[PDB]
């Protein structure tokens, strides 16, 4: 199995306050493991999993220090971007960044990422070659030129190929019980009759990890996705996920319809039907 370490920064300007809001969250696969929030009383990087308590106080202090400096960096970035776009300081804007590394089962760097978003759109991205950049427009071309003149890509490539991949290995060992599990969904179909003519069948998948899952409905080897409501996958609140797929069928034909659940924790796909009781 492949694995990822990813960090997510969000900077939000706040017209007439001393500082933007800066939040970082880190994830290994689909598990959140750290956070930093510039608005906390005494902002610090904090664990979000019990097994991160394995890291000593140097780890926390250092993550905290760079987060603070990151917050300063974002403040300047937000100012510069408004300049490029002739946007008044009176208005709030959002800069977002996602970055990290994917590693294969073989344990080595399969792919590195560094992407910026501005007011919800792609802005500037490090290419897969880890030495060139893609700018979304002429503002981002200014940022691209700055990154090229500074040689930013080189420093980031060094992180990815060393530090990133090495720490992900370590996190994967320290949280092995949490992180290396594949908890299959518990699945069942429930019945919800509006009238004597029509009933909604809801196929539920609960308690699963990791997030990726396939729920589909079939009638006779015939796929029903054009009639089904598929909700976005949602968190349990305790480190797992939940999802359902519903479709309206005629009363008395419930047994013609099957729900198929596919997930990494399942040896084979589940195929389920609504069952009396």
């Amino acid at each position: 199995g492949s694995h990822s370490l990813r960090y997510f920064h969000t900077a939000v300007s706040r017209p007439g306050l001393r500082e933007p809001l800066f939040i970082t969250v880190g994830y290994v696969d689909d598990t959140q493991f750290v956070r930093f929030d510039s608005d906390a009383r005494d902002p610090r990087t904090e664990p979000r999993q019990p097994w991160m308590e394995k890291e000593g106080p140097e780890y926390w202090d250092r993550e905290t220090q760079i987060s603070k400096e990151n917050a300063l960096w974002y403040r300047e970035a937000l100012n510069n971007l408004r300049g490029y776009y002739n946007q008044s300081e009176a208005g709030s804007h959002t800069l977002q960044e996602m970055y990290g590394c994917d590693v294969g089962s073989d344990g080595r760097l399969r792919r590195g990422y560094e992407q910026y978003g501005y007011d919800g759109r792609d802005y500037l991205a490090l290419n897969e070659d880890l030495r060139s950049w893609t700018a979304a427009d002429t503002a981002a071309q200014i940022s691209k030129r700055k990154m090229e003149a500074a040689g930013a890509a080189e420093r980031f490539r060094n992180y990815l190929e060393g530090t990133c991949v090495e720490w992900l290995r370590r996190y994967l060992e320290n949280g092995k019980d949490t992180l290396l599990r594949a908890d299959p969904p518990k699945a069942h179909v429930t019945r919800h009759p509006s009238s004597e003519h029509e009933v909604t069948l809801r196929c539920w998948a609960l308690g699963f990890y990791p997030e990726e899952i396939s729920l589909t409905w079939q009638r006779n080897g015939e796929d029903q996705t054009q009639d089904m409501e598929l909700v976005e996958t949602r968190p349990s609140g305790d480190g797992n996920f939940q999802k359902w797929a519903a479709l309206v069928v005629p009363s008395g034909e419930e047994q013609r319809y099957t729900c198929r659940v596919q997930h990494e924790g399942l040896q084979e796909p589940l195929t389920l039907r609504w069952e009396p009781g």
């Binding site: 993550e63 760079i66 300047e76 970055y99 700055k146 990154m147 420093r155």
Partner: peptide, 11 residues
């Protein structure tokens, strides 16, 4: 661990 941003490498 995360990556430190430096002011010399600026958007």
């Amino acid at each position: 661990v995360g990556y430190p941003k430096v002011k010399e490498e600026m958007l």
